[PDB]
Write a structure and sequence with these properties.
It is classed as dna-binding/regulatory protein. Four copies of one chain form a homotetramer. Chain A contains two helices and one strand, in the order βαα. Chain A has 49 residues and is an alpha+beta fold. Chain A starts with a strand and ends in a 5-residue tail after the last helix. Chain C binds four DNA strands through β1 and α3.
Chain lengths: 49, 53, 53, 47
DNA sequence: GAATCACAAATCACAAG
DNA sequence: CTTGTGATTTGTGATTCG
DNA sequence: GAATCACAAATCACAAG
DNA sequence: CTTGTGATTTGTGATTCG
């Protein structure tokens, strides 16, 4: 379903890795950040989703 | 950790609802949003893209 | 009002447990901590020091 | 559990300074009391 | 639509007593 | 110490860019 | 959420038939 | 003049870029 977004900070070096890889092999940074976040929450906060 | 001590930030826009969950968890049990982002993304790279670290 | 309009802010200390309650509440529901502290404080002044506002 | 800091409007902060200086007290004291009475008033459940 | 900015909130850590 | 506050970091609506 | 690609389908144009 | 082919031009879903 549709869902709004919220700006957050991430460490520059980690952002770059994702930037280079997504430009190299398709995708965008946001997609990845979302997935990383979800997976972190599934891991540490499984109750919450 | 000289490199890391002067490491700065990029911004990124995540799903609000995923952000809300973190906003409340860190409020309750400490830390903050950026910390969660950093760990979340470090662990993801470590998981799927270890060569890059 | 002139003084509110023009001046900035000033750091202040508070009980951690009371602060925490507001941090959780604002995380869950809308708003931010400062917002609440400024109301708290204004209401304190309008009650115990009415002649100063 | 200790202290946390917060940045309040400087005009309201001034008022408190003047008062705590003139009569007894300190800024933290007022804060603590300001906030405590606010919670009681508006968020009584949270104790 | 993602990506980035710019100014506010929030916290840090030294200063003052 | 405890309290006070300027410096610095973190948060996010606003803006950019195509 | 517009700019710029890419490609095809009109539009052109000259000449042959 | 009428009409087929190839040649610029035009309008467009698709895609790039933030």
């Amino acid at each position: 379903d549709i869902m709004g977004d919220k700006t957050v900070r991430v460490r520059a070096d980690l952002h770059h890795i994702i930037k280079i890889e997504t430009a190299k092999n398709g995708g965008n940074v946001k997609e990845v950040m979302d997935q990383a976040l979800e997976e972190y929450i599934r891991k540490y906060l499984p109750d919450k989703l």
